[PDB]
Assembly symmetry: D2
Homo-oligomer: 234 residues x 4
């Protein structure tokens, strides 16, 4: 999405606590193709909606956008631990009372990167630190388990070849991207793709796994982004 708000977000990536003047944002925001007009209305809208804060020195991210940005990055690189063959297992022992509730359970299993072995059985390696999200996910039985073909299990819980194929296609898309606006759109795709990363331990990763490639390409784009903003600043 090459929309005013999400592009000032990218242009400000890693700026905080430094402040960025309107003038500077006008400059960094234009290779993406938005003159003053749409932008000044956007900055004002964002400040009003709690997304940016303004001062005499200009603009920088809100504390709650900043903490949102921070949780995104510990989701893309969530402390992993060396793995010893154990799986977290969550068995659903209750049917949620309504549709929003059953849908929020799936959304919750996906977010914590569990795969569905089958109706009501979700698993993942215990290399991520499972914390059960209070009540909402209270109604499951938590077990630890082990499998004798864990690479096979992994291949059964997630579509590994499809996620691999999709990742390589995004690497090709970046290689082929032609301007900053093109690189930007590909990076937002890559972020959306990592969000679904099953975050598998070393031993279970197939050798054509694109995870590291996708992180490097995203961090290269974040670096080029931050560098443009020092060029203009200094």
């Amino acid at each position: 999405s090459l929309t005013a708000r999400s592009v000032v977000l990218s242009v400000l990536l890693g700026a905080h606590p430094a402040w960025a003047t309107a003038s500077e944002l006008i400059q960094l925001t234009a290779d993406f193709g938005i003159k003053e007009t749409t932008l000044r209305v956007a900055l004002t809208r964002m400040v009003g909606a709690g997304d940016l804060v303004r001062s005499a020195d200009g603009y920088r991210l809100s504390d709650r956008l900043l903490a949102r940005q921070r949780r995104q990055d510990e989701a893309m690189r969530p402390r992993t631990r060396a793995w010893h063959g154990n799986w977290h297992m969550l068995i659903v022992t209750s049917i949620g009372t309504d549709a929003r509730t059953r849908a929020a359970l799936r959304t919750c299993m996906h977010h914590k990167r569990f795969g569905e072995l089958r109706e009501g059985v979700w698993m993942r390696p215990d290399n991520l630190d499972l914390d059960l999200e209070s009540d909402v996910a209270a109604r499951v039985r938590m077990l630890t388990a082990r499998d004798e073909a864990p690479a096979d299990l992994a291949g059964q819980l997630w579509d590994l070849s499809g996620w691999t194929e999709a990742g390589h296609r995004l690497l090709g898309d970046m290689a082929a991207a032609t301007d900053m606006p093109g690189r930007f759109v590909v990076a937002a795709a890559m972020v959306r793709h990592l969000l679904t990363d099953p975050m598998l331990p070393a031993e279970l990763l197939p050798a054509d796994w694109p995870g590291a490639g996708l992180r490097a390409a995203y961090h290269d784009f974040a670096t080029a982004m931050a560098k443009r903003r020092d060029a203009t600043q200094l």
Copy 2:
């Protein structure tokens, strides 16, 4: 997404079979903030990828993009029939062999606008003409059923109040949108929201249902879009 490709799509909405010159697209594409550069590279990319066709008279949609556009609109207004209390029911009697397969079944139930009553039981009123998608969904038992509290059932299969609340928020977003780029982003949200419309018959629709409001606002935006392109053409 205010990206080069998806905005030439919107600018060409309903043009076909008429052709649009580069010059004309440069003009219609600029209030969205993209001078020649990004655009000419986009038009060329799209033609190469099979999305547009070019001629001496300029550009118009591909036959396969056109048929894609057409299937989107019979999905947003899919012939409904006056309803007589019957539900389509699909009982899954087979577990799909792999993750891509079980995921494609959910994606397939959602696309045909079935709600999940519970693990393996999907239903909807028979006001849409169910056609079972060949093999892939072969492995279900098809029944017709009726409920004594069908508005209650409907409220149990879908999050109706949440879809209502989300729809009204999008109407408010349009009312508040400030330029064509803002209206465009809100319209793409509305299209994504209608895609999930449970398409309920009259008798089951709650009176604060935003469906008609959301269709009118989308069709108003499509109309303003088509009108801009006659202004420039003539």
Copy 3:
């Protein structure tokens, strides 16, 4: 089971309200091979446990054994209605809190002669008058449904060929039974077999269905039983 209690039950079948003297029961009970001893201790035990009542004129069934006997017979011949293609459907929407509870639900579905289409979906033709057993089975959604291959559905909910094969084997067992004690044991098998009868309407019954044969053979044995007790009485 050719045990003292269950054989005085069979010997008294249909006696009530008439009374049977010890002497008479000694006579009717002996071709089954139990002299006074085991019997007098049994009669006394049964009276003490609330199964028989005694008087100066002897013994006859308890009112609560009688009502138990009566509910057995409206279970073996439960008013059926001419059928019009509709099925009762019970969808379980709640997981029972404990093992006794989930087991009692299965036991309850079997008793009301529902078949399990698949996990949590139970059905049967609506030719039996479903009454939901208060609370215990409160936690299901009740629908009516129809299938386009209802004989096929029936064959999928119950093992029809196996129940047919088992029934014929019991008819052969009766034909081959050699004395009253042998006929008695075969009749108790037949009663246990009918208890599981899916009670299908006419249109769905295969022509080698042994139901009527099994009822006639049971009612022939009940008749021979009642006749022995008039022979001795008069």
Copy 4:
């Protein structure tokens, strides 16, 4: 069941390879109340059906009844191992094609003394040596697991208080039984009750567990049975 066949089975318990003459069986079989008649017809029927073998020295069990008797006893005392917290877990990943098939899977899980945690998840401690019964149970995924409240899990997989209550009632029934025919019927109940024993390891057994009491009472009855047959023999 105090029927001719099942009582010659009990009277012959542990006789094999010794032979028992008609005369001797007439003597041992009569306190149960069956003179020559029913018996000689039974012995002949059993020999014909492959249950007994006869010779000039009389009768003794068939090799296939003997191996059946033997498998019953390694089912009532199936080598257990000192337990270390691990559970066998069987996840069903396939729906069986027909009713006889889905019913045989439940019957198979019960026979190997697995409890159903919930639809498609069966578990038990690994103190019994699970062997998967070839094909028929091929279609499950086998895992090992551990729980943090394993006594609680055990209480959730089986109705432990109900099985305890039923066991004590059978101990009371034996204490109260009045003759050999009464003791016999109670023993057959106890055998049927042990068949369902969850065979829990030491650490998970509640202290009012009736397992050992039920085995002692059965083995006391088997001993009294074998002793009667030496009294008559010698």
